[PDB]
Design a protein around this ligand. Structure first.
Ligand code: ADP
Ligand code: U1C
Length: 205
């Protein structure tokens, strides 16, 4: 059996000036999911058929249900709140941001009206201490996801099931396939690069 216990963010709070960056981080994380699903062969619909490859939650940020969108906004908060728990703080330095950025231009077949478009964050490099940081944050994000699922009643099986709460990935990070392990680490790379793209520096407090 496996129990997830991430780092403690219970005593920390997020200053009001950090909520502005929280809304933009959660936006760009959604466009990456739509693109990686179009690359995986999912079409559109208003009812959910796994064999037909049609799913309703492939539209813009504005029309998703309020029940589902809260999970994304809270996990954008815990990521910024966990950085304060490591003895570091983020401070805005560079004013030449928000006009120096652009979104990706994809071909016409990625389009129902909606077409995903993440930001172009490719010429943004990190220092070693910042890259060792993304290694620690990725394993914590798995533990935060793991702790919510145990409380919601989902256990481990061999086959995922929409009628019987069950998912095969209910394992420690050490018993995790590198194909999944990587995708958790790549999500934090876009998270840290999203902060630098708007002008935030990560230093000790
Ligand atoms: N790794 C992720 N990062 C951000 N948002 C995610 C992620 N995985 C799923 N979501 C969001 O969760 C919502 C519902 O997910 P859903 O389409 O039911 O996913 P799945 O079928 O893969 O479980 C979608 O709006 C999607 O954008
Ligand atoms: O099967 C699975 C799925 N999964 N990842 C769980 C996802 C679902 C959405 C989020 C999420 C993360 C970060 C932000 N953010 O920062 O904005 C917003 C939302 O975590 C996993 O680890 N094994």
């Amino acid at each position: 059996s496996f129990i997830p216990c991430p780092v403690d963010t219970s005593q920390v709070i997020l200053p009001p000036h950090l909520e502005k960056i929280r809304d933009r981080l959660a936006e760009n994380i959604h466009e990456l999911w739509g693109m990686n699903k179009i690359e995986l062969g999912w079409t559109f619909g208003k009812i959910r058929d796994d064999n037909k490859r049609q799913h309703p939650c492939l539209v813009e940020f504005s029309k998703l249900p309020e029940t589902e969108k809260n999970y994304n906004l809270q996990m954008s908060t815990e990521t910024l709140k966990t950085l304060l728990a490591l003895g570091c703080h983020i401070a805005h330095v560079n004013p030449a941001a928000e006009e120096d950025l652009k979104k990706v231009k994809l071909p016409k077949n990625y389009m129902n009206g909606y077409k995903p478009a993440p930001l172009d964050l490719s010429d943004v490099k990190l220092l070693p201490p910042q890259e060792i940081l993304v290694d620690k944050l990725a394993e914590n994000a798995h533990n935060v996801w793991a702790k919510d699922r145990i409380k919601q009643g989902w256990t481990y099986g061999i086959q995922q099931d929409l009628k019987n709460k069950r998912n095969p990935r209910l394992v420690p990070y050490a018993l995790l396939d590198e194909r999944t392990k990587k995708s958790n680490r790549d999500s934090l790379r876009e998270a840290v690069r999203t902060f630098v793209g708007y002008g935030y520096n990560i230093e000790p407090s």
